[PDB]
Design a protein around this nucleic acid. Structure first.
Length: 78
RNA sequence: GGUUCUCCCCGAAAGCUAUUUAGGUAGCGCCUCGUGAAUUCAUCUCCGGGGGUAGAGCACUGUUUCGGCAAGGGGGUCAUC
């Protein structure tokens, strides 16, 4: 009965700062549920902007098997 | 319900079928007596047989667990026309 505020803060910006840039259309993945753990690794998607597909994950590595240029680092900050 | 003298020989059935039949009856099965014929009949060993039961098996009809490969659908990844 109790079933976006947690992602309204990402919609309120901050968090991810890929290569030192702020306010990006980032969005956490799924197969991997990244949290500020093994940091993370970003990935540019056609639409949806940056996909934070966690650091070290198969599907991320698959993308590492396709277009490496799309691949980007990742951080957290606060 | 009961059915009164005596000895002798053999000696059943409580089954099938039908029955406004199912505790009755009839045909037949088994009884007895009489007559008449096949070494006809019974056991046995040898011989020629069909069987699908026990048992066993899982090719088939089903059922069952496990391991394998893996359709194909599910959830996600880039995609999402």
């Amino acid at each position: 009965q109790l079933q976006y505020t947690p992602q309204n803060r990402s919609k309120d910006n901050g968090r991810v700062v890929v290569e030192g840039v702020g306010n990006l259309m980032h969005h956490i993945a799924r197969c991997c549920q990244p949290i500020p753990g093994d940091e993370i690794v970003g990935f540019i998607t056609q639409g949806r902007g940056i996909s934070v597909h966690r650091a070290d994950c198969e599907q991320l590595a698959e993308l590492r098997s396709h277009a490496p240029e799309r691949i980007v680092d990742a951080v957290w900050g606060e």
